[PDB]
Amino acid sequence: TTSAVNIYNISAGASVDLAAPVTTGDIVTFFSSALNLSAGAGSPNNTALNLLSENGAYLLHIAFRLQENVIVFNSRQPNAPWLVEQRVSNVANQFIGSGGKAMVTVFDHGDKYQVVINEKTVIQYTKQISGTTSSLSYNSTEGTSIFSTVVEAVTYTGLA
Amino acid sequence: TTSAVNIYNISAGASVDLAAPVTTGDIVTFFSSALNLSAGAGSPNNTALNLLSENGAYLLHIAFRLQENVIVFNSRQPNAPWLVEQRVSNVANQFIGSGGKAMVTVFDHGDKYQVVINEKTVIQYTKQISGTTSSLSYNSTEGTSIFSTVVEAVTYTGLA
Ligand SMILES: O=S(=O)(O)O[C@H]1[C@@H](O)[C@@H](CO)O[C@@H](O[C@H]2[C@H](O)[C@@H](O)[C@H](O)O[C@@H]2CO)[C@@H]1O
Ligand SMILES: O=S(=O)(O)O[C@H]1[C@@H](O)[C@@H](CO)O[C@@H](O[C@H]2[C@H](O)[C@@H](O)[C@H](O)O[C@@H]2CO)[C@@H]1O
């Protein structure tokens, strides 16, 4: 009845507090104005996108590792070790059909997180930790990020 | 469970067939890489965005008229006159907080269409005609469109 759109500019190395939290049924899309599939090696993550809970837990962690040619999805409670991680091989293969820019979409299916790169679904992630997303972060390895220094994020909340 | 993201490049003067139709609960966002709030007068519409049914009906018509400083929302069946139109005054006032670009979002609330410009909801439109959206069009008055010649459209379907 009263859905909402919120726009955020996220500089590399930062985290932003969402004006409106993301919960079951809502969406989050990240827009990158550049694509560098051959920029270098990450220590270990070239670029990471994170969905965080109000408690500081990493609901969803998305990491792109060029040197290891893989994409990692994991979670963890604050001050706790990294949990069971799911990985997807072939980075470039996922960005086929980009052309100087990319977008990553995350659907919050309540009990799962659907991750989409452009138009291709790369994985149906099962939530290891539950809860609403209240902040987002974009971290990088200095100079080897595969996305622009500033990444735009649009959230669609108050849906279903 | 299996939502989908589809990306389209819509050149001014064209209409594109959606690979995935837009129905109750789905979303459509238009991205413009430019904003010209002082480009000229439309004959009468400077730029119009349309959601069309498989039968050619204009489910939702969105028109920006600089000379008349208003935004019109209407509908109509094919080969029929224009129906009851809703208008919103003050064009620029809606794009406050743009900065060289804009985005228009349309939420299909089943019995209504919620139109958002950037983060501001401009109107809750009551459907005069129902049905799923199968194609979209971007029409302009030669040389006086307030959006870029090519407008990007992203649809989020198969949601609720
Ligand atoms: O920047 S970090 O968040 O600290 O990077 C860590 C994360 O990317 C997690 C993701 O689960 O992985 C850590 O590396 C793991 C590696 O994926 C795993 O294969 C290996 O067995 O253990 C490493 C250390 O936990 C990143 O360091
Ligand atoms: O390019 S058109 O689609 O033919 O432009 C028409 C539309 O913008 C409709 C929107 O309902 O309006 C038409 O003009 C109206 C005008 O807004 C209204 O005030 C007057 O009563 O009737 C006109 C003709 O229906 C546009 O021509």
PDB file of N, CA, C and O in Angstrom, chain B residues 52-86:
ATOM      1  N   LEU B  52       1.841  -0.569 -21.133  1.00  0.00           N
ATOM      2  CA  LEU B  52       0.799  -1.067 -22.032  1.00  0.00           C
ATOM      3  C   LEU B  52       0.448  -2.541 -21.860  1.00  0.00           C
ATOM      4  O   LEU B  52       1.318  -3.360 -21.574  1.00  0.00           O
ATOM      5  N   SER B  53      -0.830  -2.864 -22.075  1.00  0.00           N
ATOM      6  CA  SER B  53      -1.320  -4.238 -21.969  1.00  0.00           C
ATOM      7  C   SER B  53      -1.081  -4.990 -23.270  1.00  0.00           C
ATOM      8  O   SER B  53      -0.678  -4.406 -24.274  1.00  0.00           O
ATOM      9  N   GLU B  54      -1.328  -6.294 -23.244  1.00  0.00           N
ATOM     10  CA  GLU B  54      -1.122  -7.138 -24.415  1.00  0.00           C
ATOM     11  C   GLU B  54      -2.119  -6.787 -25.520  1.00  0.00           C
ATOM     12  O   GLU B  54      -1.950  -7.167 -26.676  1.00  0.00           O
ATOM     13  N   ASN B  55      -3.156  -6.055 -25.149  1.00  0.00           N
ATOM     14  CA  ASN B  55      -4.186  -5.660 -26.088  1.00  0.00           C
ATOM     15  C   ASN B  55      -3.914  -4.250 -26.614  1.00  0.00           C
ATOM     16  O   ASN B  55      -4.667  -3.725 -27.423  1.00  0.00           O
ATOM     17  N   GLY B  56      -2.833  -3.641 -26.140  1.00  0.00           N
ATOM     18  CA  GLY B  56      -2.480  -2.303 -26.581  1.00  0.00           C
ATOM     19  C   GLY B  56      -3.039  -1.172 -25.741  1.00  0.00           C
ATOM     20  O   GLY B  56      -2.802   0.000 -26.032  1.00  0.00           O
ATOM     21  N   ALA B  57      -3.778  -1.503 -24.691  1.00  0.00           N
ATOM     22  CA  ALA B  57      -4.348  -0.473 -23.835  1.00  0.00           C
ATOM     23  C   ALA B  57      -3.256   0.241 -23.035  1.00  0.00           C
ATOM     24  O   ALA B  57      -2.213  -0.338 -22.731  1.00  0.00           O
ATOM     25  N   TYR B  58      -3.499   1.506 -22.711  1.00  0.00           N
ATOM     26  CA  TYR B  58      -2.556   2.289 -21.930  1.00  0.00           C
ATOM     27  C   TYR B  58      -2.917   2.175 -20.456  1.00  0.00           C
ATOM     28  O   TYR B  58      -3.632   3.029 -19.919  1.00  0.00           O
ATOM     29  N   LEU B  59      -2.429   1.114 -19.813  1.00  0.00           N
ATOM     30  CA  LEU B  59      -2.685   0.877 -18.395  1.00  0.00           C
ATOM     31  C   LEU B  59      -2.359   2.128 -17.605  1.00  0.00           C
ATOM     32  O   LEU B  59      -3.180   2.619 -16.834  1.00  0.00           O
ATOM     33  N   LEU B  60      -1.149   2.636 -17.802  1.00  0.00           N
ATOM     34  CA  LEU B  60      -0.719   3.850 -17.136  1.00  0.00           C
ATOM     35  C   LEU B  60       0.088   4.714 -18.099  1.00  0.00           C
ATOM     36  O   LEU B  60       1.024   4.242 -18.748  1.00  0.00           O
ATOM     37  N   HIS B  61      -0.297   5.984 -18.176  1.00  0.00           N
ATOM     38  CA  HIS B  61       0.340   6.986 -19.032  1.00  0.00           C
ATOM     39  C   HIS B  61       0.889   8.067 -18.093  1.00  0.00           C
ATOM     40  O   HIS B  61       0.136   8.616 -17.275  1.00  0.00           O
ATOM     41  N   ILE B  62       2.194   8.344 -18.191  1.00  0.00           N
ATOM     42  CA  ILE B  62       2.833   9.369 -17.363  1.00  0.00           C
ATOM     43  C   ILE B  62       3.427  10.438 -18.277  1.00  0.00           C
ATOM     44  O   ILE B  62       4.356  10.165 -19.038  1.00  0.00           O
ATOM     45  N   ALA B  63       2.901  11.659 -18.182  1.00  0.00           N
ATOM     46  CA  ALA B  63       3.349  12.749 -19.039  1.00  0.00           C
ATOM     47  C   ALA B  63       3.855  14.015 -18.343  1.00  0.00           C
ATOM     48  O   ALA B  63       3.169  14.601 -17.506  1.00  0.00           O
ATOM     49  N   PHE B  64       5.049  14.449 -18.726  1.00  0.00           N
ATOM     50  CA  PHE B  64       5.656  15.640 -18.156  1.00  0.00           C
ATOM     51  C   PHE B  64       5.539  16.813 -19.120  1.00  0.00           C
ATOM     52  O   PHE B  64       6.082  16.773 -20.226  1.00  0.00           O
ATOM     53  N   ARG B  65       4.829  17.856 -18.696  1.00  0.00           N
ATOM     54  CA  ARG B  65       4.629  19.039 -19.524  1.00  0.00           C
ATOM     55  C   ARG B  65       5.227  20.275 -18.862  1.00  0.00           C
ATOM     56  O   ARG B  65       4.644  20.844 -17.943  1.00  0.00           O
ATOM     57  N   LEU B  66       6.400  20.676 -19.332  1.00  0.00           N
ATOM     58  CA  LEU B  66       7.074  21.851 -18.801  1.00  0.00           C
ATOM     59  C   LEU B  66       6.212  23.098 -18.996  1.00  0.00           C
ATOM     60  O   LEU B  66       5.848  23.767 -18.027  1.00  0.00           O
ATOM     61  N   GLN B  67       5.878  23.400 -20.250  1.00  0.00           N
ATOM     62  CA  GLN B  67       5.064  24.570 -20.569  1.00  0.00           C
ATOM     63  C   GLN B  67       3.816  24.672 -19.671  1.00  0.00           C
ATOM     64  O   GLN B  67       3.425  25.767 -19.275  1.00  0.00           O
ATOM     65  N   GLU B  68       3.203  23.536 -19.345  1.00  0.00           N
ATOM     66  CA  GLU B  68       2.025  23.519 -18.474  1.00  0.00           C
ATOM     67  C   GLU B  68       2.400  23.221 -17.019  1.00  0.00           C
ATOM     68  O   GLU B  68       1.528  23.140 -16.156  1.00  0.00           O
ATOM     69  N   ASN B  69       3.696  23.047 -16.762  1.00  0.00           N
ATOM     70  CA  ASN B  69       4.222  22.751 -15.425  1.00  0.00           C
ATOM     71  C   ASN B  69       3.373  21.738 -14.657  1.00  0.00           C
ATOM     72  O   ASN B  69       2.941  22.001 -13.536  1.00  0.00           O
ATOM     73  N   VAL B  70       3.134  20.577 -15.257  1.00  0.00           N
ATOM     74  CA  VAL B  70       2.324  19.549 -14.608  1.00  0.00           C
ATOM     75  C   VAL B  70       2.704  18.136 -15.054  1.00  0.00           C
ATOM     76  O   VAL B  70       3.400  17.941 -16.053  1.00  0.00           O
ATOM     77  N   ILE B  71       2.245  17.154 -14.289  1.00  0.00           N
ATOM     78  CA  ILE B  71       2.483  15.759 -14.589  1.00  0.00           C
ATOM     79  C   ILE B  71       1.112  15.113 -14.688  1.00  0.00           C
ATOM     80  O   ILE B  71       0.305  15.201 -13.759  1.00  0.00           O
ATOM     81  N   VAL B  72       0.847  14.465 -15.815  1.00  0.00           N
ATOM     82  CA  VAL B  72      -0.443  13.825 -16.017  1.00  0.00           C
ATOM     83  C   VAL B  72      -0.389  12.313 -15.971  1.00  0.00           C
ATOM     84  O   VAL B  72       0.530  11.685 -16.499  1.00  0.00           O
ATOM     85  N   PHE B  73      -1.399  11.739 -15.336  1.00  0.00           N
ATOM     86  CA  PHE B  73      -1.525  10.300 -15.226  1.00  0.00           C
ATOM     87  C   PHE B  73      -2.897   9.931 -15.781  1.00  0.00           C
ATOM     88  O   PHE B  73      -3.917  10.442 -15.319  1.00  0.00           O
ATOM     89  N   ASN B  74      -2.927   9.067 -16.787  1.00  0.00           N
ATOM     90  CA  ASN B  74      -4.201   8.661 -17.354  1.00  0.00           C
ATOM     91  C   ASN B  74      -4.119   7.253 -17.908  1.00  0.00           C
ATOM     92  O   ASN B  74      -3.093   6.581 -17.774  1.00  0.00           O
ATOM     93  N   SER B  75      -5.207   6.817 -18.532  1.00  0.00           N
ATOM     94  CA  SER B  75      -5.291   5.486 -19.115  1.00  0.00           C
ATOM     95  C   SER B  75      -6.292   5.502 -20.271  1.00  0.00           C
ATOM     96  O   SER B  75      -6.984   6.502 -20.476  1.00  0.00           O
ATOM     97  N   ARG B  76      -6.354   4.402 -21.024  1.00  0.00           N
ATOM     98  CA  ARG B  76      -7.296   4.275 -22.134  1.00  0.00           C
ATOM     99  C   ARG B  76      -7.170   2.947 -22.873  1.00  0.00           C
ATOM    100  O   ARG B  76      -6.091   2.362 -22.936  1.00  0.00           O
ATOM    101  N   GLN B  77      -8.289   2.462 -23.407  1.00  0.00           N
ATOM    102  CA  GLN B  77      -8.289   1.219 -24.167  1.00  0.00           C
ATOM    103  C   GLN B  77      -7.832   1.585 -25.566  1.00  0.00           C
ATOM    104  O   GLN B  77      -7.759   2.766 -25.914  1.00  0.00           O
ATOM    105  N   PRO B  78      -7.499   0.583 -26.388  1.00  0.00           N
ATOM    106  CA  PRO B  78      -7.062   0.931 -27.739  1.00  0.00           C
ATOM    107  C   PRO B  78      -8.263   1.470 -28.513  1.00  0.00           C
ATOM    108  O   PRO B  78      -9.400   1.037 -28.293  1.00  0.00           O
ATOM    109  N   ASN B  79      -8.010   2.418 -29.406  1.00  0.00           N
ATOM    110  CA  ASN B  79      -9.074   3.000 -30.213  1.00  0.00           C
ATOM    111  C   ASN B  79     -10.248   3.411 -29.333  1.00  0.00           C
ATOM    112  O   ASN B  79     -11.375   2.935 -29.497  1.00  0.00           O
ATOM    113  N   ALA B  80      -9.953   4.294 -28.386  1.00  0.00           N
ATOM    114  CA  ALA B  80     -10.935   4.827 -27.456  1.00  0.00           C
ATOM    115  C   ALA B  80     -10.371   6.162 -26.983  1.00  0.00           C
ATOM    116  O   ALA B  80      -9.170   6.397 -27.075  1.00  0.00           O
ATOM    117  N   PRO B  81     -11.229   7.059 -26.479  1.00  0.00           N
ATOM    118  CA  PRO B  81     -10.759   8.369 -26.004  1.00  0.00           C
ATOM    119  C   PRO B  81     -10.006   8.265 -24.675  1.00  0.00           C
ATOM    120  O   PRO B  81     -10.065   7.236 -24.020  1.00  0.00           O
ATOM    121  N   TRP B  82      -9.298   9.325 -24.289  1.00  0.00           N
ATOM    122  CA  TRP B  82      -8.558   9.342 -23.025  1.00  0.00           C
ATOM    123  C   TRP B  82      -9.537   9.408 -21.848  1.00  0.00           C
ATOM    124  O   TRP B  82     -10.494  10.177 -21.880  1.00  0.00           O
ATOM    125  N   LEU B  83      -9.288   8.611 -20.810  1.00  0.00           N
ATOM    126  CA  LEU B  83     -10.174   8.573 -19.648  1.00  0.00           C
ATOM    127  C   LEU B  83      -9.955   9.689 -18.632  1.00  0.00           C
ATOM    128  O   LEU B  83      -9.463  10.771 -18.971  1.00  0.00           O
ATOM    129  N   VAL B  84     -10.333   9.423 -17.383  1.00  0.00           N
ATOM    130  CA  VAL B  84     -10.209  10.414 -16.317  1.00  0.00           C
ATOM    131  C   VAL B  84      -8.754  10.603 -15.942  1.00  0.00           C
ATOM    132  O   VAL B  84      -8.105   9.671 -15.465  1.00  0.00           O
ATOM    133  N   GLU B  85      -8.243  11.814 -16.137  1.00  0.00           N
ATOM    134  CA  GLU B  85      -6.846  12.068 -15.832  1.00  0.00           C
ATOM    135  C   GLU B  85      -6.575  12.772 -14.516  1.00  0.00           C
ATOM    136  O   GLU B  85      -7.257  13.724 -14.142  1.00  0.00           O
ATOM    137  N   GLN B  86      -5.562  12.272 -13.817  1.00  0.00           N
ATOM    138  CA  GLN B  86      -5.129  12.831 -12.549  1.00  0.00           C
ATOM    139  C   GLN B  86      -3.870  13.628 -12.848  1.00  0.00           C
ATOM    140  O   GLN B  86      -3.030  13.190 -13.636  1.00  0.00           O
TER     141      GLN B  86
END
